[PDB]
Design a protein around this ligand. Structure first.
Ligand SMILES: [Ca+2]
Ligand SMILES: [Ca+2]
Ligand SMILES: [Mg+2]
Ligand SMILES: [Mg+2]
Lengths: 548, 548
């Protein structure tokens, strides 16, 4: 019933998607010119990365003005026409709300570092917007997220003569959520955009808002309380809008970000826990880690929906796996040391899978078949690669590859003048991987993706169904049912690189006939004790309905 | 065994493969520079299209000098070094021997058209090298092969004042094999090349040598007798050399080109009969035509070996199928009328299969898994397309696509200066489809092909085994065994575009365990009555061994 539950999401970065004025930077007019492509793909909601004024030290997640549009992306008018046109096509759009911190170039912080009092005796009302310390000795049981860059979560400010807190880069000072004026400022920022018609927000780094002595400073009850506040505001003032949480934590802690029926928080949260186990299972040819980790996720509220994903603008995060699992992933998916960043792996989806289309298809089917609303990362529809020559996580944020012309069609500016260089290598470069090609190619990955979303869209049980794992007698083979409104789907997936045999426990479905979702080819009726023998080719996916 | 039985063949055209001197024309030095690529691919024998002097009215199959090298391709020295280097790498090489006719520019024909007697009263000894008629009324129960171009197999020569015979173009007059001088001329031509160390010949258009009143003028006993003469000569003078027949006929008539143990003809013949049924079965999702047509092929001599192929330098021939089968193929594989030529379809393999890699892989596995020695058509290993803007069958003979540089790496001459233009379209063009890319791409089609030939090479039962079709209870699924030297291979192939179920009749193999040839994953042991249930994903191939 709520729109987000049946939507397909698409994550993109305006500066990196389409340049409309030849300066090497993506912009809103450019994005707007590509809306037909997104609609045709089968996308329903666009999630745009931060578009606000910013020195871009963390690519826009260091925000310097919550109520504007970064100059290189265009103007606020350009934004309003973009939104009009998106809505004209039946697309929703959500922004990225950066709550935990601002840029050090935010006027607030420039004001705040003047000290507790102005030179004229008056109180500096902005000073307590941020989190200050005399010695930087507090919150010591606290981990560092940007392990490769920051040595400490406290940094000394020259002119303020005190240490300030930051969970991310030193140029991203944390906001102080014990100060109620800060809560107002952000309720107000969100309002500004929701008043223009924005359909919601992806909310950034939600676990880290409140910090408390003698705790990890993650997932604190007071942090959750503030988030309940946001949801309460939106429910009252902007019914129907979406709030989606970036909360990368273990299952028990992630689910709490939905809140409860009585005290709601987020409508949606990313399913961070399943994501690594997908990759792990593929290398191990053993899907048990998927069932285990999915099994640890409690039921969610009635309004709740998972956002399922494979990759995104960040590294493949390994922060919320065991030390053994982390080491395995590095060994398997980060052979070069240059591939690691801050407890994670900074590679695009296709390279991670050795550009093996069968493996790419497989994981995409799992993405679309698990319970939640799926999100695609821009460029993965065509099999884009990465560029590890770029610092930080920018190697997975190269320009979208539209055609084989100048700079992949992203801009008329030459490749070395683009904000990030478009990829030109013989395997993943825009000469070989681009939209124009794949639109004309009857069997391209783009076309496959669209066809597969069409298929999903035609079976609501994917969006809304329950989930029940089936025993297969072979850990390489992952089987489950999705049931909803009388419909029973059976999804069988082979994570091995060669043919595999299984014995499915279909005892609950004796007497019923499985048929392929695609073309209704019938398989043998389920008989006897219901132990159903199968064979599967390498990386096969069987999308079935059980007819009664 | 004989070398040809375990060889993998590769068909290529020198003018079109690699240019070494920037004139837009492929040549021998160029070819020689690409021998490592062919060896590494897993090729054993190169079959070169005609390399002889010629006006190229049928792309070199109109021969004007049997004992030379066409100037565009280089010199006779260039040839000798090419051969030495091929042999240095353990590669065999065969040429194309054009027996049935010559160019009208051949000195023989220039001499012959002077008439039976010279202007000085002397007899013209060359006049009877060709086949002449006063009225062109003879051999009227005879079909026309180039239906789109030729209205008659007789053509009036201006200066000779008589009609001459030609099964092919009017510029390709048939040689007269009732004149024994002609037989000597060609025994001699073959000798010239075999003396240089050439390992054999593909022999062109063998059914059409002798023509007789009141017959079809195809497959005549006197034609076969002459071919026995060629074989006899090579067996005596050049033991170990290969003779491979182009004989496109129905099963009963093709097999006769092997001759018998007592009177041998050809070592190898192309398996023309199976080829169309492969394509048909895929569209119909019903493999019965393959079993039917394979079933009609009699056993062949001990020295005999089939040459299995999917495509070649000609059209996809529909001359030897039923009228109903022909109409179906046109409907399914020739939607544009421009795609038909002379009772066939002039398209490359990948375009025929909608560039669907799964379908490409499938047919390739079948090519490699049927009994015979397989032949690859140059460029199909990377998924090359075609150019229907070129006349006749030249649209499948575009330059090999080596890299994304100038003219696909085929030449430094620009694309409009190449002999045939290298393909530039967004789907199949050299920017997207080339060797360099696929060598660097871990999961490319090139790499797949090589990996799959490796796999074949490791199981001699593919080359030498018998063949037995297995009952599957589903026409979409084609199963068979190949047995040799105690080894039993089981090959199961799905020709449907969605998942299929089968029940394999493995009664003869109760108690034995099928394992994947690739990685030895075991499947359930064959039990009970031996009726073995399977499921297959779309276009899957299962390559299995049955272990005792
Ligand atoms: Ca904080
Ligand atoms: Ca003849
Ligand atoms: Mg711009
Ligand atoms: Mg040349």
């Amino acid at each position: 019933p709520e729109w987000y539950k049946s939507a397909v999401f698409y994550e993109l970065s305006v500066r990196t998607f389409q340049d409309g004025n030849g300066d090497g930077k993506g912009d809103f007019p450019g994005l707007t010119s590509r809306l037909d492509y997104l609609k045709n793909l089968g996308v329903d909601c666009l999630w745009l990365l931060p578009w606000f004024p910013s020195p871009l030290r963390d690519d826009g997640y260091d925000v310097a003005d919550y109520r504007g549009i970064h100059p290189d992306l265009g103007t606020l008018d350009d934004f309003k026409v973009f939104l009009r046109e998106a809505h004209a096509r039946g697309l929703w759009v959500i922004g990225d709300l950066v709550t935990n911190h601002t840029s050090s170039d935010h006027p607030w912080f420039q004001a705040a570092r003047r000290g507790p009092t102005l030179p004229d005796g008056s109180p500096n009302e902005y000073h307590d917007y941020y989190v200050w310390s005399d010695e930087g000795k507090e919150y010591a049981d606290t981990r560092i997220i940007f392990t490769d860059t920051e040595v400490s979560n406290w940094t000394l400010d020259e002119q303020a003569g005190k240490y300030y807190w930051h969970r991310f880069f030193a140029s991203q000072p944390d906001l102080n959520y014990d100060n109620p004026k800060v809560v107002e400022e952000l309720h107000g920022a969100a309002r500004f955009w929701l008043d223009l018609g924005l359909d919601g927000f992806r909310v950034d780094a939600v676990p880290y808002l409140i910090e408390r002595e003698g705790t990890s400073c993650e997932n604190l009850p007071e942090t959750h309380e503030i988030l309940k506040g946001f949801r309460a505001m939106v429910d009252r003032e902007y019914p129907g809008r979406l709030l989606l949480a970036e909360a990368n934590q273990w299952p028990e802690e992630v689910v709490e970000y939905f809140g409860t029926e009585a005290e709601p928080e987020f409508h949606m949260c990313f399913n961070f826990p399943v994501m690594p186990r997908l990759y792990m299972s593929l290398k191990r040819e053993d899907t048990s880690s998927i069932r285990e980790i999915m099994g640890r996720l409690p039921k969610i509220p009635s309004f709740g929906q998972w956002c399922i994903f494979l990759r995104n603008h960040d590294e493949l995060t390994l922060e919320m796996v065991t030390d053994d699992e982390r080491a395995f992933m590095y060994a398997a998916y980060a052979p070069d040391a240059r591939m690691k960043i801050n407890v994670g792996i900074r590679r695009r989806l296709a390279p991670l899978l050795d550009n093996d289309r069968r493996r790419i298809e497989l994981l995409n089917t799992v993405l679309l078949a698990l319970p939640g609303s799926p999100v695609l990362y821009y460029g993965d529809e065509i099999g884009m690669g990465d560029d590890l020559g770029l610092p930080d996580r920018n190697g997975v944020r190269t320009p979208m590859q539209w055609n084989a012309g100048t700079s992949g069609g992203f801009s008329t500016a030459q490749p070395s003048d683009c904000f990030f260089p478009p990829i030109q290598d013989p395997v993943y470069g825009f000469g070989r991987v681009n939209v124009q090609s794949q639109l004309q190619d009857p069997s391209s990955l783009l076309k496959w993706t669209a066809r597969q979303l069409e298929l999903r869209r035609a079976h609501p049980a994917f969006a809304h169904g329950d989930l029940t794992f089936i025993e297969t007698g072979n850990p390489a083979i992952l089987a489950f049912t999705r049931q909803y409104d009388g419909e029973t789907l059976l999804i069988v997936s082979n994570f091995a690189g060669n043919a595999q045999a299984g014995l499915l426990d279909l005892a609950p479905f004796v007497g019923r006939a499985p048929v392929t979702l695609s073309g209704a080819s019938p398989l043998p009726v389920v008989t006897g004790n219901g132990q159903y023998p199968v064979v599967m080719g390498k990386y096969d996916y069987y999308w079935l309905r059980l007819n009664s």
